[PDB]
Design a protein around this ligand. Sequence first.
Ligand SMILES: *[C@@H]1O[C@H](CO)[C@@H](O[C@@H]2O[C@H](CO)[C@@H](O)[C@H](O)[C@H]2NC(C)=O)[C@H](O)[C@H]1NC(C)=O
Ligand SMILES: *[C@@H]1O[C@H](CO)[C@@H](O[C@@H]2O[C@H](CO)[C@@H](O)[C@H](O)[C@H]2NC(C)=O)[C@H](O)[C@H]1NC(C)=O
Ligand SMILES: *[C@@H]1O[C@H](CO)[C@@H](O[C@@H]2O[C@H](CO)[C@@H](O)[C@H](O)[C@H]2NC(C)=O)[C@H](O)[C@H]1NC(C)=O
Ligand SMILES: *[C@@H]1O[C@H](CO)[C@@H](O[C@@H]2O[C@H](CO)[C@@H](O)[C@H](O)[C@H]2NC(C)=O)[C@H](O)[C@H]1NC(C)=O
Ligand SMILES: *[C@@H]1O[C@H](CO)[C@@H](O[C@@H]2O[C@H](CO)[C@@H](O)[C@H](O)[C@H]2NC(C)=O)[C@H](O)[C@H]1NC(C)=O
Ligand SMILES: *[C@@H]1O[C@H](CO)[C@@H](O[C@@H]2O[C@H](CO)[C@@H](O)[C@H](O)[C@H]2NC(C)=O)[C@H](O)[C@H]1NC(C)=O
Ligand SMILES: *[C@@H]1O[C@H](CO)[C@@H](O[C@@H]2O[C@H](CO)[C@@H](O)[C@H](O)[C@H]2NC(C)=O)[C@H](O)[C@H]1NC(C)=O
Ligand SMILES: *[C@@H]1O[C@H](CO)[C@@H](O)[C@H](O)[C@H]1NC(C)=O
Ligand SMILES: *[C@@H]1O[C@H](CO)[C@@H](O)[C@H](O)[C@H]1NC(C)=O
Ligand SMILES: *[C@@H]1O[C@H](CO)[C@@H](O)[C@H](O)[C@H]1NC(C)=O
Ligand SMILES: *[C@@H]1O[C@H](CO)[C@@H](O)[C@H](O)[C@H]1NC(C)=O
Ligand SMILES: *[C@@H]1O[C@H](CO)[C@@H](O)[C@H](O)[C@H]1NC(C)=O
Lengths: 348, 249, 241
Amino acid sequence: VAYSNNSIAIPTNFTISVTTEILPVSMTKTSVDCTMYICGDSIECSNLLLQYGSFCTQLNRALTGIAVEQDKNTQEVFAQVKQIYKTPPIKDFGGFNFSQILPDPSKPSKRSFIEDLLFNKVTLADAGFIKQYGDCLGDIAARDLICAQKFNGLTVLPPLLTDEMIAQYTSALLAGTITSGWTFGAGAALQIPFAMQMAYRFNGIGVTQNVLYENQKLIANQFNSAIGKIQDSLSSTASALGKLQDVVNQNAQALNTLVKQLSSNFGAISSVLNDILSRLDPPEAEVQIDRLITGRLQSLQTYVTQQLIRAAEIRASANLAATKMSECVLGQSKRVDFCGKGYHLMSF
Amino acid sequence: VLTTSKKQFLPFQQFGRDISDTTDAVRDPQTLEILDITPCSFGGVSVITPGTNTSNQVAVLYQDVNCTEVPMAIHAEQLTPAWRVYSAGANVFQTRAGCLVGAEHVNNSYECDIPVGAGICASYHSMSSLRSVNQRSIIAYTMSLGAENSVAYSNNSIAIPTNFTISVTTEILPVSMTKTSVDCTMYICGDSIECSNLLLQYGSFCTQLNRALTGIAVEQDKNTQEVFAQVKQIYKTPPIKDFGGFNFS
Amino acid sequence: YRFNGIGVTQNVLYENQKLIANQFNSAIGKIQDSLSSTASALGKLQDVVNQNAQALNTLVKQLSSNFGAISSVLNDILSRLDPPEAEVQIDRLITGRLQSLQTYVTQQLIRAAEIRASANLAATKMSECVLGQSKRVDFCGKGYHLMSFPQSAPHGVVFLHVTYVPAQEKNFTTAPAICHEGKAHFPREGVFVSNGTHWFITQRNFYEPQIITTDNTFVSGSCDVVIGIVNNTVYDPLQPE
Ligand SMILES: *[C@@H]1O[C@H](CO)[C@@H](O[C@@H]2O[C@H](CO)[C@@H](O)[C@H](O)[C@H]2NC(C)=O)[C@H](O)[C@H]1NC(C)=O
Ligand SMILES: *[C@@H]1O[C@H](CO)[C@@H](O[C@@H]2O[C@H](CO)[C@@H](O)[C@H](O)[C@H]2NC(C)=O)[C@H](O)[C@H]1NC(C)=O
Ligand SMILES: *[C@@H]1O[C@H](CO)[C@@H](O[C@@H]2O[C@H](CO)[C@@H](O)[C@H](O)[C@H]2NC(C)=O)[C@H](O)[C@H]1NC(C)=O
Ligand SMILES: *[C@@H]1O[C@H](CO)[C@@H](O[C@@H]2O[C@H](CO)[C@@H](O)[C@H](O)[C@H]2NC(C)=O)[C@H](O)[C@H]1NC(C)=O
Ligand SMILES: *[C@@H]1O[C@H](CO)[C@@H](O[C@@H]2O[C@H](CO)[C@@H](O)[C@H](O)[C@H]2NC(C)=O)[C@H](O)[C@H]1NC(C)=O
Ligand SMILES: *[C@@H]1O[C@H](CO)[C@@H](O[C@@H]2O[C@H](CO)[C@@H](O)[C@H](O)[C@H]2NC(C)=O)[C@H](O)[C@H]1NC(C)=O
Ligand SMILES: *[C@@H]1O[C@H](CO)[C@@H](O[C@@H]2O[C@H](CO)[C@@H](O)[C@H](O)[C@H]2NC(C)=O)[C@H](O)[C@H]1NC(C)=O
Ligand SMILES: *[C@@H]1O[C@H](CO)[C@@H](O)[C@H](O)[C@H]1NC(C)=O
Ligand SMILES: *[C@@H]1O[C@H](CO)[C@@H](O)[C@H](O)[C@H]1NC(C)=O
Ligand SMILES: *[C@@H]1O[C@H](CO)[C@@H](O)[C@H](O)[C@H]1NC(C)=O
Ligand SMILES: *[C@@H]1O[C@H](CO)[C@@H](O)[C@H](O)[C@H]1NC(C)=O
Ligand SMILES: *[C@@H]1O[C@H](CO)[C@@H](O)[C@H](O)[C@H]1NC(C)=O
């Protein structure tokens, strides 16, 4: 950089840039049947587990705490405003186009075109799909992992907030920000013309209001082009939402590894409870069964401990997402690089 | 459960084992027909109940079972009569979370009281037939996100407040947790002279547990110090003086 | 100064000082009544004490379990078995009891990290809201933060957040700029509003209509560039003198 005591550089133009920040809010909620995983529905087994029942209760208590936290994390990020602002019939917004981000009425789930692209990019089909006992029983030939974990007592609990409800919360925040700007976040929403609200945002970053009014047509066109570029980038790049895909992959991998742990024998003659029961009388059988029970309990304990550490990381990201929603979506933030590189104007 | 198996074993092969190593498929000894082996239980039961003091009424939710398949899944025919009532029809409601029985579905939407899941919530409510005798029953309803509202937006219209409200709100944040220390020998040996001779090798593990606990204890004191010791200067409260009429006593 | 920070003029506080003091006193009284009449107020602090007590209680319960040993009582094994046979049974109890202690320590470490994050937020809240006025939205309570008061609580800190919330509002016609004589005029700190036949400049937060004047507004460019410009006269204080 050319530095001089009497030299300064002043911009004679400006660029409007839209950037995407992705933060994980929640992780899959899972519950484990201790007897089904260790005993495998064996009548002889679970008589030994009666003393170990207290340990199983502790594992269930930790898992239930993670599940309630995930619902709370989603609620904090999307339920900041209880008032659901109905999207108005589109009115002149100064030439700014928000139809792509606004929910589409003529489609299922009432979700935005950008939201539809994001849903397509992340594959949750691999992580789980509804399985009836009949569906698993009929499809014996295909070894789907979801049926195998369900048979071993590992199951996934559906989130309390449905995707449609999350979309309705997102639409309400979007409607409030365009129509009333920062006013809806604190106190009752007060309607303001979008161009006048945009001038206030320019005043916040230290640019005079007149510059926005004279260049309003150019500013609206630059914003529309940036939104179009973002949708094209999401559609043409498969690897966009990497963090969200990683969260689903880690949870599915952890359940799959637990099913694999059953194959291991912890010093027992066989890893199959049935084989030990068939070949050994009960006093000799108990010693071998106890070795399998202790190892299987340890595998469940290791899985629960990993889930608790993952939940803490997800909780920190969810807290940041809630802070980002209040600071950038409900207000203009003067923090540097908190709401994107450059001087923040607004966030959707 | 035994079912016919599409998979065919090679002549040397007599039985099949899955990834878990359980015998997924077996061949009948008398007849060479492969039979798949399936666990009888599928799992998935939750009991939604108001406090037992308030009522003994309960609602049962099956996560993976449709209302038609509910009796077969739980083997209701061989179950106790009280269990059969929970598998009985007329209270069955089908949800994405699963079939829910013992709860009366209501169109009205309320703030969630107990979370069934998939946008469905259950509450104990005063639903009375004929509205002449008060009756209490569990109800299943879609949760209410909030009151629907529409902002009136115009290119030349603005709303400006002509008054204001001063509001005081309380935010509670945990600063510290109880500090605890564990005597490894006392907990495991229970003051036994014979015990602890074996623990001499395991002493290193006990030292590791004590080191982690001591670190938590010092952190809790540090957490309290950071929040309350921001200013070392202790400002003496002045005899109360006029504060503009603001009361802080 | 706090009112000036949220964008409300100092004069509004001075004229309404008696009302502002009464509203603050009423809010403090409402808070004390709510705490006294509602048992379930400090849920998070109670949960922290309950979790710690539950963890110690479960550890005492774990002693009852026997990890493949003939008895969970060390004394019974010692009484019925000679030392070589007794050692195998004692070792099974020792390994299981050590595992129970290890599980408890691991849970405590995860809980300590959650408490540490909350304590760090509390320290940030104390510096940003108690020692200063924070412009962050919803960091120091809903509404425009004015000041915060810390109150000591067991295992926690309770923050009383005093905030300014806009009350009743009215509808007013608005224009981005005023065309006085072929020159666009933009309001320096206010929004142009019309009661219906007259145009005034007022602060957005509170309604204080004022006659448009050369000091009140700045003139930039020409009327044609502004899309919503409307015709009005800008008064000049210098011209009568
Ligand atoms: C600031 O940059 C903008 C955008 O690059 C310029 O607007 C362009 O003007 C040229 C004509 O010179 C047109 O061909 C382009 O279509 C305009 N861009 C868009 C996207 O509308 C603008 O001219 C620049 N301003 C200055 C002071 O040079
Ligand atoms: C906002 O942008 C969208 C997408 O560019 C515009 O939607 C187009 O609408 C026309 C009809 O007016 C259709 O023929 C196009 O297929 C739509 N998409 C595209 C890619 O052009 C929408 O009209 C824009 N909103 C306004 C009012 O400008
Ligand atoms: C702004 O709000 C305050 C508080 O509500 C109003 O002051 C009160 O008005 C009511 C209505 O008559 C009186 O009964 C109270 O005695 C007043 N004082 C208080 C502290 O409640 C005030 O009048 C309102 N101002 C406007 C512009 O309407
Ligand atoms: C500030 O408020 C307190 C109450 O919290 C006032 O103290 C007295 O409180 C009792 C009830 O607890 C009332 O019966 C008294 O009337 C209150 N004071 C008096 C002398 O009337 C305290 O006086 C208030 N401070 C001021 C100076 O207004
Ligand atoms: C300011 O104007 C808006 C729009 O006219 C008002 O909002 C409407 O108020 C009427 C009154 O009955 C309702 O029927 C409408 O449903 C409201 N919204 C719409 C979309 O028209 C608003 O109430 C006015 N402000 C005040 C102070 O009344
Ligand atoms: C809008 O505000 C103006 C203030 O300019 C009001 O005009 C006043 O009207 C009253 C009587 O109607 C006169 O006594 C004042 O001298 C006027 N003030 C002036 C000329 O500055 C006007 O009444 C208000 N209302 C409407 C509907 O226009
Ligand atoms: C606001 O005032 C301007 C300036 O007086 C008006 O502009 C005139 O518009 C008429 C047609 O309505 C033209 O014939 C003149 O050439 C314009 N200039 C002048 C100097 O008179 C304008 O009509 C007024 N109204 C609006 C809505 O802008
Ligand atoms: C055994 O006898 C049964 C009944 O007669 C017959 O169905 C089966 O094929 C026989 N299997 C062998 C081993 O021959
Ligand atoms: C049940 O709870 C209520 C308070 O909600 C209490 O008054 C009542 O005593 C409780 N019942 C019993 C049997 O203690
Ligand atoms: C089972 O219930 C679900 C709703 O939870 C429904 O979509 C499905 O069609 C029903 N039928 C099946 C597949 O058993
Ligand atoms: C509930 O809604 C359905 C569908 O609109 C309707 O058929 C039914 O009569 C309504 N009433 C109740 C409480 O079932
Ligand atoms: C405001 O909206 C009306 C109705 O659509 C329109 O006639 C008028 O030209 C618009 N004015 C501006 C400032 O865009």
